[PDB]
Amino acid sequence: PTIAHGDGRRPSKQRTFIVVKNCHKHHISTEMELSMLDLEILHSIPETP
Amino acid sequence: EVHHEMASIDTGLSYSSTMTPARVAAITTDMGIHTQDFFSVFPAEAFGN
Numbered sequence: 001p002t003i004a005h006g007d008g009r010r011p012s013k014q015r016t017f018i019v020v021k022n023c024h025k026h027h028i029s030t031e032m033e034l035s036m037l038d039l040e041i042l043h044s045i046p047e048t049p
Numbered sequence: 050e051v052h053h054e055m056a057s058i059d060t061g062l063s064y065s066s067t068m069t070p071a072r073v074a075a076i077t078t079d080m081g082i083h084t085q086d087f088f089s090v091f092p093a094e095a096f097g098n
Contacts, residue, residue, distance in 0.1 A: 004053065011050055 002014050059065060 004051075006053070 002012055005011075
């Protein structure tokens with residue numbers, strides 16, 4: 001922005017400058033250990049109580 | 050160019066503001082031992098020899 005100076009009468013519009021900045025990217029990886037027989041139970045939905 | 054005019058008048062019959070020095074930010078002069086040189090301010094003087 002700019003301050004309106006009336007004393008010097010040196011009028012100036014806003015000085016819009018442009019810089020550029022890098023976007024860092026990060027990549028985290030964990031593993032989930034699901035057992036086999038529990039997934040076999042989870043696939044075959046039963047009806048018996 | 051937008052010209053803005055306004056007019057001020059102190060309604061207080063006495064002073065109504067105060068300007069107290071509160072904090073030294075920095076001391077600009079080095080506060081050192083630097084004597085000014087009289088052979089620089091008076092370079093047109095000398096002795097008889």
